[PDB]
Input
Amino acid sequence: MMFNFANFYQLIAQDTRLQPWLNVLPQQLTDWQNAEHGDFPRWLKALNKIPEGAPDQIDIKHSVTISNDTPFHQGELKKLESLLRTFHPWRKGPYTVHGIHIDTEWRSDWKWDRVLPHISPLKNRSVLDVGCGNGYHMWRMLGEGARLCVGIDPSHLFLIQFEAIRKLMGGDQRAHLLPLGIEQLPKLEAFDTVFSMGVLYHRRSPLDHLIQLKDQLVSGGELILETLVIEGDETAVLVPKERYAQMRNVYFFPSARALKVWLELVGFEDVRIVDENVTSVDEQRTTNWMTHNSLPDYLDQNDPSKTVEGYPAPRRAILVAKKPGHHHHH
Amino acid sequence: MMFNFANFYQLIAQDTRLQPWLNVLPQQLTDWQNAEHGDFPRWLKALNKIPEGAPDQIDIKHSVTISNDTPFHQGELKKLESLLRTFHPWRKGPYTVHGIHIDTEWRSDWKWDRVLPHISPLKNRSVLDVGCGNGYHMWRMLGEGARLCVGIDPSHLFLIQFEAIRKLMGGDQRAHLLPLGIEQLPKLEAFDTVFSMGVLYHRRSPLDHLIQLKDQLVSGGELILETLVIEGDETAVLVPKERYAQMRNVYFFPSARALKVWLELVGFEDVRIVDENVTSVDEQRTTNWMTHNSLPDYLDQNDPSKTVEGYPAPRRAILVAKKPGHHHHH
Amino acid sequence: MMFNFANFYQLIAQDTRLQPWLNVLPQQLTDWQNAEHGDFPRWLKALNKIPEGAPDQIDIKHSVTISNDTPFHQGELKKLESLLRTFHPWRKGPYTVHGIHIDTEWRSDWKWDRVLPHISPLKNRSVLDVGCGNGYHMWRMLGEGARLCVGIDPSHLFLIQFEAIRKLMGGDQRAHLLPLGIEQLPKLEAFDTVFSMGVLYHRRSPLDHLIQLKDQLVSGGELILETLVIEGDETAVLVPKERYAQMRNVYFFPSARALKVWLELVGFEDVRIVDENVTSVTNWMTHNSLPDYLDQNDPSKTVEGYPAPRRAILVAKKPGHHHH
Amino acid sequence: MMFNFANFYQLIAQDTRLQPWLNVLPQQLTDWQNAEHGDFPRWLKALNKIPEGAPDQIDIKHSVTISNDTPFHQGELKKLESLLRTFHPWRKGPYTVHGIHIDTEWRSDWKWDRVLPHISPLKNRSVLDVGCGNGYHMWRMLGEGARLCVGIDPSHLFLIQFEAIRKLMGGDQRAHLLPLGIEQLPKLEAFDTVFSMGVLYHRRSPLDHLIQLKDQLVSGGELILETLVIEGDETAVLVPKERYAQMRNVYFFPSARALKVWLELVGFEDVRIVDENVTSVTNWMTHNSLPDYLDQNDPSKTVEGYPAPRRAILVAKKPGHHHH
Output
């Protein structure tokens, strides 16, 4: 046993739409325990030192902020900040926990604010967050009245970060992170809303990824899909001969308008492009006195409109679509 | 869904020795939902009408007796007795529930009294009851301070009877019945004590049955094995050419002394024969004014020392054995 | 048992590179016997009546032509033509067997002539023909000195047509048609040359299709890939919202230059675009011979408004030195 | 690849009743190639040096004897005897090949002579020989007109010895030894006759062993079952607390009358106890020729105190009419 998922097994056992998941999940998580550990056991020792127990104040509406009415002792706060610092890098965020500002590589808060007006109200919805990273967005979804959030992301570090935040939240059982790829899930048709965050361009079969997402949604459910794109019409699709912005294991970069056609082909309805930006809009940069060149490593220093390989600079599009059928329970 | 096993999934999820069982159990119980229903849906409608809620008094020490300080209304008691009567036949017992005496085909109470002095104290033990029928013995095991009892018996009727008694007990979660054969279990090595009640003579491979039981026990665990036997020494073993006492699907009927050697061969220790009787010792008979011949149908009316087929009349032996190794947690 | 593949089991048993295929093929063909029969048992009764025995003359070099020195009697020829006619429609060909001109609907011979100059010589090569139809091209490949041709095509009718031609060839064991999808093959790495003709645009995962093909080739083996394409550069890729040219179950239509990049990504070498043409083809009661899938006011477009069909042929090499 | 079973794949491919075996056999033999090799690759190099080609004279009727009209040169015979000697120990036999008397440790010929009168005539029968050792009896079965003999025995050495004899027979394809346990076979119902010799008492589930054997027989086929037994009636069955006659991994030793009931329960017909004998057999430096497993003060008992070994032979029929 590296990490016990007992609490998740208990939750899905008591949920009639998720109980079928017990037919495949336990073997997958048993196998994960015996796979390459890496740093997970060292990280787990730090997680175990983070103080247990409910905080006094939680904001998951306007930010992700945890605080006590009575602040912590200088010693306990130094130790807590030091434990959290060992889990670098923190990508999604940012977080404020007992005065400590976890200053993340991404402004997930700003992207959340720009997307939220375009999505169906989360009140009482079950949500699957695919490529959920450390789980930032699941807190924001509970903040909007989500009943249940399940995150899936295969990173050991993301599971530790999530469990550290969940522990500082007092063990909130409404959000969970499973170390899985979406391809490991059976056909649940169980969630009201599915988020796919930055996964499509890593998949050799982009249409199989879109069908896998459709298969997790109830009748009339909603998909929010974010991926890297290029500018162009319905027939613009980049596939790089080697690496894209220094990344290996990259396949399809459709235009947003191309991606809209792909979603319609596999059977989604009411497809809208709701946001498109250069990725730097939502990135933070370490920009101190020691900084050499300010340009990210993945951009050409001679022309920051291009990657080091000479492709167009990264752009992120966010689409919202509907699975066919009437959405039940309002 | 015919019957939801959520509560069992929750229990084994929170138990580190039983959690591995989630790797095979859920698919088996999913398949059971879709197998031939028979009368289970009609029976379930009666179970659902049995009154919910804790009784005032429970004796599971000296009997299995349930009672309220304030007795039930004449109407509610007639309805309850009528519901319970639809689940005939009640084999293991007997039971007394709110004044209603469930007068069973077997005196499981007397056999329990004769065996109890020969078994390791049940206090804080986990127990697997193989061939558990309606689950009578699991109540008696909790009565002796067992922490946990799991019953396995593939009969639809036995699951209903057990759930009716469990409901009248106020939903006691320390005992459960799974509709499984012992051959469906993986190698758990999780129980302190295993009971095998009247299963061995139904198994084509009696040694595989004994190894399956050894595989469910912890180091130093205890087996109590009951089966049908013949008189004789270590080389006396009946295999009938067709039926035995009118029963189809019957294989090996060793002498008790033969069975002791079989247990030693597959690796058990400290094997003791603790009880041997004609089966009629522990049977009840309907013996009223209308009775034609008093002899059970399976006995020869011309010679009640023999079956109708001419084999020796049924005898039951009870053996107690130890899995090798030191038993941990005292 | 609808059809006995004993002869193919025997062939791959005696071949070192194909024997591993026996680990999965027999259960797949057992399951195929038990699937929806349709007309296959009736068709098989016609195949059983087709005359057995070697013909005197075989041309598989310039055509697919079978003849006896001494021609058949008018009765035997009427019966044989009647049996062959029961397997309509014949798409790939044409075939001429003992004077009977089989009623083929495509000129597979012209396609073959346009391909042939661009491929590595077939002498002593083993060839996998994916989407092989009734197997016309496998005969032409044997005609060019191929050691062995295996065709992959799930149609009941294609297997009957193939076995009818094979029987009239005297049971030639150097060509075989298996009713399988390419996705059912394991990683054989057994063939010198693989043809994928008209398959890629039917596959939901086109890169998994290219990897499937690479996985059937030996070191230094050759892929010939023909598919429907659009004009444009390396980022031109059409996916329809529903049908393309009135075809259902269609996915990716890259430009040939896009397809070249896809093949390089998957690990192919020396990728060449070898041929590219706008497709043409009727009933004589039709006003014109424009397919129904073309826009009648602009035949450069489909009725759905996309660019009209174009076929490209690419040739590529799996990395490594090609042995014997 | 340690040993190529291509010839067996080809044989069962061309046999209607055995072709279904291709659904499971190839993966099992692939896994066997990759299991613990031991000496098998060294042994195979000796097998490869044994001279190929048909001998002039074969007796498989009265013995197993191979000879040329023109004998081998003293050099060729020394080399061949040296190669055969590398596969020690030879248990079943004896064998005489080109004048060389193979050093067999059992008189399988006497066993064969005692069995033969009790079995249905072998002419044109297919036979499964379970626990066949180096395959001595399969030669004798062919000698009696058996169409086909398949031996089932997991020993590396047994397969080498068999293939050495088969090679000296000129590659006779009517007998084959597969390195499998009986539990690995599917339900073939393909053989006219099944032999199970010295296997039952090694099986933890003896009734599953009897059902396994019934499952390999055609309608009306015959089982010959030989095992170790005790004296007694239908309820006499020995199971040891640990070893029987110093053998580990042993389970049930029924009386022959008990075994007859077991066969009837499992659904066999016309069950006959045909033969029953107390077994005998040394090094000449031994005080006596009592096996070490016998009690020296009472050789009617094992050293463990059980009854001494006895062998019984039973013959039974699967229900149904036996075709051709």
Q: What stands out?
A: The first strand of chain D starts at residue 57 and ends at 59. Residues 1-324 of chain D form one domain. Chain D has one domain: 1-324.
